[PDB]
């Protein structure tokens, strides 16, 4: 993997792996230092918290990927957010945004690795913006379940199980723009009656992937074009 | 800087890639016959669109001035997705780099590799800010957010308020930016902003009277403009 070789390149340049447990914040929106984090193992989400305390979930990040809170060119903030750990365990190499440019200059197979993750991210946020915007809040819930089925799902004799040890009703609402937790509950019950989803084991299971797929066409296309292994597993 | 953009332009010309002229309503690329490029848009105004099977038009984003727009992945040479890039100004000039030539060019001069990397970091951050603000307060917040955006980039101080100087900009086009397909849904929001004295529609142009009001609904974007485009932000203070 490129991830494996980047991991090694990091350890060889004195950058060591740091472990985290559930609910720990790799960075926070008040930290005045900026970073590049190479998330290597684990599951994570990016949040923003309002002036009043309202919480928006911007995105899940899994597996090996990179997340940046600063600009290389200027070293200043891209904007203020948190990266929270969701899984029982995660590991990440934290680099100061001031050290990045020199690291990537030196070994440009790694420069292209990070640019690749930037292209994926660029393209992903666009697809997601298209699908969340059309069909309003119905399509938002269908779009987020589709993302979670492709990334975290698993084949199972009773459907496709979403392997998120938590995933609460309120948590889904934070990812859509939904303030009331009962509004989410309507959407979830409405999808249950039509045999789209089921809920057992403290876990969500999907059963008409085709239905979701119809509310989230730009994203399905994106899994196909950007992550064809992940996509082919359930297609 | 933006001396960086001029420098990239010069580097491309030296290396045999020539400028190209496009005209209002032309497509540089389209979603039905996808081609893979780096578009270096040098001068003029464009919009990235998608049209769904039922005829629903989504305006994803406006692109101006100097900027970079990718339609393929360099590592794999395939599509990032199916979109249209449509010219809004009367003229626009762009450098159309084939995706299979880009790596070579960026590999021989890291200065320009980093200018492209920076532009893409600005895109990522812009999309997150816009997603935050469009999501939190329904369609009211989406329309206020797109107005603040167009006010910073295309606005001009006049005696009647900040005039959005953008060729068309109709009710319907404004609705396309936030997944609104019926004009009646937009006018309902614009009616409220008019009653509340935030905007005036006059001489076929929107004039903004209370930018501070739009900031309440678009707090992540105003922060993004502050951090990412301080000259543009400073102009309107």
From Swiss-Prot, chain A:
Residues spanning the signal sequence: none
Source organism, top-level taxon: Bacteria
A cellular-component GO term for this protein: cytosol
Entry keywords, A to Z: Activator, DNA-binding, Transcription, Transcription regulation, Virulence
Gene3D superfamilies in the record: Jelly Rolls, Single helix bin, Winged helix-like DNA-binding domain superfamily/Winged helix DNA-binding domain
GO MF term list: DNA binding; DNA-binding transcription factor activity
Cited function: Positively regulates expression of listeriolysin, of 1-phosphadidylinositol phosphodiesterase (PI-PLC) and other virulence factors.
Protein name as catalogued: Listeriolysin regulatory protein
Gene of this entry: prfA
